[PDB]
Scaffold this active site. Structure first.
Site, mmCIF file in Angstrom:
data_model
loop_
_atom_site.group_PDB
_atom_site.id
_atom_site.type_symbol
_atom_site.label_atom_id
_atom_site.label_comp_id
_atom_site.label_asym_id
_atom_site.label_seq_id
_atom_site.Cartn_x
_atom_site.Cartn_y
_atom_site.Cartn_z
ATOM 1 N N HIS A 39 -2.576 -4.181 -3.680
ATOM 2 C CA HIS A 39 -1.687 -3.515 -2.730
ATOM 3 C C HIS A 39 -2.051 -3.986 -1.339
ATOM 4 O O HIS A 39 -2.483 -3.228 -0.443
ATOM 5 C CB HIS A 39 -1.761 -2.004 -2.848
ATOM 6 C CG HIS A 39 -1.081 -1.454 -4.056
ATOM 7 N ND1 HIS A 39 -1.783 -0.866 -5.097
ATOM 8 C CD2 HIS A 39 0.232 -1.432 -4.420
ATOM 9 C CE1 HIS A 39 -0.924 -0.513 -6.044
ATOM 10 N NE2 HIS A 39 0.308 -0.825 -5.652
ATOM 11 N N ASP B 169 4.023 -0.454 1.270
ATOM 12 C CA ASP B 169 2.639 -0.183 0.893
ATOM 13 C C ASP B 169 1.607 -0.321 2.020
ATOM 14 O O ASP B 169 0.412 -0.466 1.752
ATOM 15 C CB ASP B 169 2.271 -1.054 -0.316
ATOM 16 C CG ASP B 169 2.688 -0.460 -1.654
ATOM 17 O OD1 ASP B 169 2.806 0.826 -1.761
ATOM 18 O OD2 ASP B 169 2.899 -1.286 -2.618
ATOM 19 N N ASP C 282 9.564 -3.763 -6.476
ATOM 20 C CA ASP C 282 8.192 -3.336 -6.569
ATOM 21 C C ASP C 282 7.607 -3.518 -8.030
ATOM 22 O O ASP C 282 6.376 -3.686 -8.224
ATOM 23 C CB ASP C 282 8.145 -1.844 -6.193
ATOM 24 C CG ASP C 282 6.837 -1.435 -5.696
ATOM 25 O OD1 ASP C 282 6.067 -2.335 -5.261
ATOM 26 O OD2 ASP C 282 6.615 -0.192 -5.675
ATOM 27 N N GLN D 50 -0.146 -3.817 -20.767
ATOM 28 C CA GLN D 50 0.967 -4.498 -20.151
ATOM 29 C C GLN D 50 2.188 -4.382 -21.010
ATOM 30 O O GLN D 50 3.265 -4.284 -20.506
ATOM 31 C CB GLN D 50 0.690 -5.969 -19.918
ATOM 32 C CG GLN D 50 -0.027 -6.293 -18.631
ATOM 33 C CD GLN D 50 0.670 -5.782 -17.384
ATOM 34 O OE1 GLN D 50 1.813 -6.099 -17.115
ATOM 35 N NE2 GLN D 50 -0.033 -4.991 -16.628
#
Ligand SMILES: COc1ccc(C2=NN(C(C)C)C(=O)[C@@H]3CC=CC[C@H]23)cc1C#CC(=O)NCc1ccccc1
Ligand SMILES: [Mg+2]
Ligand SMILES: [Zn+2]
EC number: 3.1.4.53
Length: 327
Positions: free
Chosen positions: A78, A119, A236, A287
């Site tokens: 981030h 962010d 995002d 994932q």
């Protein structure tokens, strides 16, 4: 007054700015860790946003550098590279043919500015972490969308920095509209809103209208903002739609960040978090679950909204999903 050779190799990479799967990491490197500044600059110029909103270029640059420097270089995921990527991805989504001439320049500015700030000053830990540690940010925002509220507050407060007010020539009307949109967009990047955004997107796709043949009809703020909110949220959550060389780097970085949060959640004796634990996690099945439960349902509904424009992206996501499954 011609480019250095580095400035030149950068400019050649930046010709990919309108393509899904830009070499964003390479951009970061070639720009001296300035991906957000250079990419925002390029996009603003490309879309003529400086002329439209009468933004002095020195002001734009100054704000952008300042914004980029309030991303934490010691946070693996981030950070400013993620910001740059969400910006560029939102940029590409805005150019989709199903949306041609739908949005005003102010809404475009909103989606893009929102992406860039969304962010900023992220500490590399989650809302839950912040809330549970009794952190100042959690207390400030009365535990509700703590990070999102902070990103917005910081992105806007920075406009007050010396020669940073990029919105200085906008009208009060323009500013109030822009502000509301940017708040609405960034607040929608809190994953606790994903289900309701997805639901609303699903219902919009069912009752989908179209005009002049091809192009979506959005005739109210609710619908308009919903599409922009879901567009940026797609940006995002776009890492698994990117070529695998890109995708894998993103995963690595998020894992570092989560494992490092996990390390802090044992360094603090806390309860470990969903997929934040080393010598104790499966990266690949997580994932796959991330793709099955969150990323595919969203992108499939998006691809449906803008059919057939997002085919290659949905394909790539499905390929990456298959790839991760083999392990
Ligand atoms: C590129 O990978 C990623 C990229 C991003 C995220 C994010 N997750 N979340 C939530 C979903 C935990 C956030 O709130 C973050 C903040 C804003 C948006 C997305 C961020 C997660 C992963 C992952 C993974 C992974 O392997 N298991 C994690 C996982 C496994 C099963 C189900 C959900 C998550
Ligand atoms: Mg966020
Ligand atoms: Zn993000």
């Amino acid at each position: 007054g011609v480019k250095t050779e580095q400035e030149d190799v950068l400019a050649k990479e930046l010709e990919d700015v309108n393509k899904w799967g830009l070499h964003v990491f390479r951009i970061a490197e070639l720009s001296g860790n300035r991906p957000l500044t250079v990419i925002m600059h390029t996009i603003f110029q490309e879309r003529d946003l400086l002329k439209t909103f009468k933004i002095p270029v020195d002001t734009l640059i100054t704000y952008l550098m300042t914004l980029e420097d309030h991303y934490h270089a010691d946070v693996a995921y981030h950070n400013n590279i993620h910001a740059a990527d969400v910006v560029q991805s939102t940029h590409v989504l805005l150019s989709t043919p199903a949306l041609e001439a739908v949005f005003t320049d102010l809404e475009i500015l909103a989606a893009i500015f929102a992406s860039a700030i969304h962010d900023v000053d992220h500490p590399g830990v989650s809302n839950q972490f912040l809330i549970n540690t009794n952190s100042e940010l959690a207390l400030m925002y009365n535990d509700s969308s703590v990070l999102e509220n902070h990103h917005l507050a910081v992105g806007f407060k920075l406009l007050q920095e010396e020669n940073c007010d990029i919105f200085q020539n906008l009208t009060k009307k323009q500013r109030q509209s822009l502000r509301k949109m940017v708040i609405d967009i960034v607040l929608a990047t809190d994953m606790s809103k994903h289900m309701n955004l997805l639901a609303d997107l699903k219902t919009m796709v069912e009752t989908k209208k179209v005009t002049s043949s091809g192009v979506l009809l959005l005739d109210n703020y609710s619908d308009r903002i919903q599409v922009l909110q879901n567009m940026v949220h797609c940006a995002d959550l776009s890492n698994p739609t990117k070529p695998l060389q890109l995708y894998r780097q993103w995963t690595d970085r998020i894992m570092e960040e989560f494992f490092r949060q996990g390390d802090r959640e044992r360094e603090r004796g806390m309860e470990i978090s969903p997929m934040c634990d080393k010598h104790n996690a499966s990266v690949e099945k997580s994932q796959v679950g991330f793709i099955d439960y969150i990323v595919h349902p969203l992108w499939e509904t998006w691809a449906d909204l803008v059919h057939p424009d997002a085919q290659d992206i949905l394909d790539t996501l499905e390929d990456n999903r298959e790839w991760y499954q083999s392990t």
